[PDB]
């Protein structure tokens, strides 16, 4: 509905992508934090991450909660087909 105002130094597409990436990153971070808080003291994932032997807090988050956004050349997944990513989706679909 053309209500979005463009950020200084940025295109309308650039600010739209920035806002969506901000929302998704905040979501992924919050889910990871919740998953890390839910861990017990006996959990072997926590026992390995805390000691720093191997693995990390993002690995725990991806295993338990949400794998997260997938990026191609530092951008969100492009439109290899005409105006869509796969033939399963509708044209002009910018949803997550």
């Amino acid at each position: 509905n053309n209500e979005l105002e463009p950020t200084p130094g940025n295109t309308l597409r650039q600010t739209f992508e920035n806002q969506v990436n901000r929302i998704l990153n905040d979501a992924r971070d919050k889910t990871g934090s919740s998953a890390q808080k839910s861990l017990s003291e006996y959990n072997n994932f926590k026992s390995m991450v805390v000691s720093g032997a191997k693995g990390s807090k993002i690995n725990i988050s991806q295993v338990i909660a949400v794998v997260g956004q997938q990026n191609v050349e530092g951008k969100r997944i492009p439109f290899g087909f005409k105006h869509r990513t796969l033939p399963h989706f509708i044209k002009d679909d910018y949803g997550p």
């Binding site: 087909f81 005409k82 796969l86 033939p87 399963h88 509708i90």
Partner: protein, 147 residues
């Protein structure tokens, strides 16, 4: 499309494409085009029905096979640049139904989503629970497994 589905004078290997915005219609009989079979969806319903499945389950001693399934207009071969004009449904029982109405113009449905994998990647149990580099490593290492 009717003639291609009836196999009448257009071989099922011929691909036909209508680009509406540019007003072009392209027909390819050329060799080397890669294609895969898909189920036809009319309205919200598959054209594959219970009699086809019964006959295919009694496939032995009935001389009824995948060619007879193709000749009935149930399955269709589609190549890469015809997929651009195709609205695909991942599974019938899930995406044909009156869920919240994302789309209603579905024209095709996949046989099974696991058919997107190759020969070496089809031996991996639970490949959607792994990281893609590890799936690639297994696909490469399976050719070296002894037997």
């Amino acid at each position: 499309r009717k003639l291609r589905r009836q196999m009448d004078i257009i071989v099922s290997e011929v691909s036909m494409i209508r680009d509406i915005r540019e007003r072009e219609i392209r027909i390819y009989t050329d060799a080397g085009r890669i294609c895969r079979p898909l189920l036809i969806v009319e309205k919200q319903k598959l054209l594959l029905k219970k009699r086809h499945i019964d006959q295919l389950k009694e496939r032995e001693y009935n001389n009824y096979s995948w060619q007879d399934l193709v000749a009935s207009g149930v399955v269709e071969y589609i190549d890469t640049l015809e997929e651009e004009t195709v609205m695909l449904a991942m599974t019938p029982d899930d995406l044909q139904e009156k869920e919240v109405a994302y789309c209603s113009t579905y024209t095709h449905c996949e046989i099974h989503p696991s058919m997107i994998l190759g020969v070496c990647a089809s031996i991996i149990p639970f490949p959607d629970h792994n990281q893609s580099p590890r799936n690639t490593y297994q696909s490469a290492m399976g050719k070296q497994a002894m037997g």
